[PDB]
Amino acid sequence: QALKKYTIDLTERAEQGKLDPVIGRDEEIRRTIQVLQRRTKNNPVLIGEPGVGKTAIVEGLAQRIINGEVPEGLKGRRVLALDMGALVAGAKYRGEFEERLKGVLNDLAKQEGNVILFIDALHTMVGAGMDAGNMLKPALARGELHCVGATTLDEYRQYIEKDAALERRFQKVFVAEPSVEDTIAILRGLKERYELHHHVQITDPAIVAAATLSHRYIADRQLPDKAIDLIDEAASSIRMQIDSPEELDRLDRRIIQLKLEQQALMLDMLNEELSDKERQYSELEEEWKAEKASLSGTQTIKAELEQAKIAIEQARRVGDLARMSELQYGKIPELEKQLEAATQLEGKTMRLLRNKVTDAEIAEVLARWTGIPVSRMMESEREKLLRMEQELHHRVIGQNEAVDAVSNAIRRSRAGLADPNRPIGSFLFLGPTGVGKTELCKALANFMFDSDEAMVRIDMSEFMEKHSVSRLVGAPPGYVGYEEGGYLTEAVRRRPYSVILLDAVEKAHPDVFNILLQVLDDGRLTDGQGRTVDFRNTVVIMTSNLGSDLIQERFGELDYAHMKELVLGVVSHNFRPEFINRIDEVVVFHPLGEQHIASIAQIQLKRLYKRLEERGYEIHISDEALKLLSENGYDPVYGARPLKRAIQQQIENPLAQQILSGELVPGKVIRLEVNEDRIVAVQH
């Protein structure tokens, strides 16, 4: 008449079996029942950071009711879940909603403690209009309503520390996030449920993988819900792999290619090759159909097992005698033995394949979930990693120890050997500039991510003053800078596997270094809104110049190590000594030899020829001209940029003079040959 017009019996859904194994949580549900059987303040309300399944603990209460695992005083009861949007949606006329609520409350009064009223998402019932707070304040006052509440911590603190009477009708139950192992047990029960659903096998090392890695690499949500994500999306992935198959797809592309080619040929013998590949495809397809039939039989036998489990639970709730034992004892001899026969048959026959969710599926859903590259080494990435020195000396010549330390950092990343208290490997760079510090970091970014700026390059001259820490972390709440957050925490919390360069750091004012002390030690770090962000999958690199006189004076006649100690003492006199203690390693640069200079000139010529061929102009060059550029573009005092700009001069100015002269014919090899002291461009 009124009740089931708007309410949901979850205990019926437990009888319907559409609910789920609620595992552990017994202390919590006990304390719930304790608050249920009070005199005053009878109404419990659940509190925790979301993901911990307050809905689940309510439904597990309902399951323990239907099982009769509760004590006696709450047996035979009702737990009925009430939407408010069910209540509202027809309230055209005034008072209509209020009459609905009033009739519901009076019929709850008529049930006389039969019903545990459950209301999800409780702070809706705060606001519906007075609406329900006063309009359940009599039912609050009487305690005949035994409402059970559910919320985030916040809307408790928003809305319920606002009223007093509503506060003192409800009793905080601080539901905690579980640990690793209770979550593991919950995962095993719902592993059984997920293999019931998604046509799979799930391996217990994949469970411990899900627990461990989601405890490391997801800084957003909490347990168990992230592990639910991992397992469920791996289930989807295996489902799609079995629904695909790639080898069938390769052969179908091959046969339609050869079919088109033969129909163009209509000598052929491609007729024979097409027929052979069609035969091969048909064989593998028939194998695929047989495997599909095998897994389909597996799903049917598992589903009939589950139907038997539901029926014997009906017999456990009601109290059927000997029919349940006869059903079990007759049934799962044969279903256990031909389940194992189908299991060994699939272990034979699956080729084209996988049915066990392993760790590798979890890792691939990780490295495509956020995208920290944790999956084990597919070799093009791995053999690209192993050539990393040559990769960098595609773009960065010399500075070899720096290259080595950087590659060591990348390797200790991908081996999984990084301590997750910390970022991957931090660096301070040194030496007088233009020797390829910022360009080395950009070359890393071109490697790892395939862009220069897709990396976080924040030069520090934005940060010379105390106040502009809010340019990176941000504004505290309650201002105008509340809708664009930070910029550093943003450009991590999008893509937490990224390079962060803070080039030329020692301009800045050292409260920026206070921020960066929290950075380099722990990697969680308070953003602007009053929460935190992971850093533990980044690399933070900073630069300097500060032993410029020292290195331009003394890189000769010294080793690497005492040079390091000397300029380390210099920066000790500059920074605080913690911030050089926090570094993974300081790497010291050096003045340069003319072979590096010539290689640099080669690199810039290749860039130049790229631009000119995009323009459409074509060059061979004197390399005596390169020698004269080398002899003129040298200095010890700077390095590479004066070479660059001298080359810029002594080529590109008279060259572009001749180009915008309308003089040089496109397509002709522009021989850059020397003059006596200039370098000529001819057309021959």
């Binding site: 309230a91 055209k92 006329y93 005034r94 003053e465 105390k466 106040h467 309650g478 201002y479 105008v480």
Partner: peptide, 24 residues
């Protein structure tokens, strides 16, 4: 028999500024 409607009742926040005031 007369029914109801639903209203806007809209406004904005109040903001603050904040001012550094340099030492030297």
């Amino acid at each position: 028999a007369a029914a109801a409607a639903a209203a806007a009742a809209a406004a904005a926040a109040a903001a603050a500024a904040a001012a550094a005031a340099a030492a030297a």
